[PDB]
Design a protein around this ligand. Structure first.
Ligand code: HEM
Length: 154
């Protein structure tokens, strides 16, 4: 798949807002995911002990990871499709070390859309959301193809 320049502009426009508060967004997203799909929290050995949302919100550790994760995704999105180099080290760690099924990548894509929709209604209408979805699908499709070559295809 290929996104048009107009679709990238919509994605990058909302992303500029996300960058005014990387840590706040990273936090909201992770928490959202963990709430609506508790199983995913099991993948994090440093977070499993987090019982309530108040526990998550207060966790300085979940916040730094939300920043590290959003920054890697931001780096990928700005490549506007030309992200193969960035995708490699990433695919290898999630398939081989952390073992994250594609399904979990879908779930987080969902959390991302939910959060942007809450915090940025004005820059996230139907078209902006279509663009963001097409972008994350692209990302997932490439990660999946990559998982396969590394012998996981989880
Ligand atoms: C757009 C999606 C994602 C991006 C851009 C991303 C990015 C990252 C980055 C950059 C790291 C740092 C070092 C490494 O490469 O391992 C990381 C770590 C990790 N990721 Fe992700 N990730 C994504 C999705 C996921 C998902 C859905 C899960 C789990 C349900 C996941 C689980 C983990 C775990 C277990 C670690 C390491 C935790 C730690 O020791 O700090 N990642 N991720």
């Amino acid at each position: 798949m290929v996104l048009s320049e107009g679709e990238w502009q919509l994605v990058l426009h909302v992303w500029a807002k996300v960058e005014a508060d990387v840590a706040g967004h990273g936090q909201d997203i992770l928490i959202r995911l963990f709430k609506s799909h508790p199983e995913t929290l099991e993948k994090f050995d440093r977070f499993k002990h987090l019982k309530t949302e108040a526990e998550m919100k207060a966790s300085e550790d979940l916040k730094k990871h939300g920043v590290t994760f959003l920054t890697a995704l931001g780096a990928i999105l700005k490549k506007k499709g030309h992200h193969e180099a960035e995708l490699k080290p990433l695919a290898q760690s999630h398939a081989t070390k952390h073992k994250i099924p594609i399904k979990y990548l879908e779930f987080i894509s969902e959390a991302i859309i939910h959060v942007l929709h809450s915090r940025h209604p004005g820059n996230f209408g139907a078209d902006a959301q279509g663009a963001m979805n097409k972008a994350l699908e692209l990302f997932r499709k490439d990660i999946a193809a990559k998982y396969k070559e590394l012998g996981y295809q989880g």
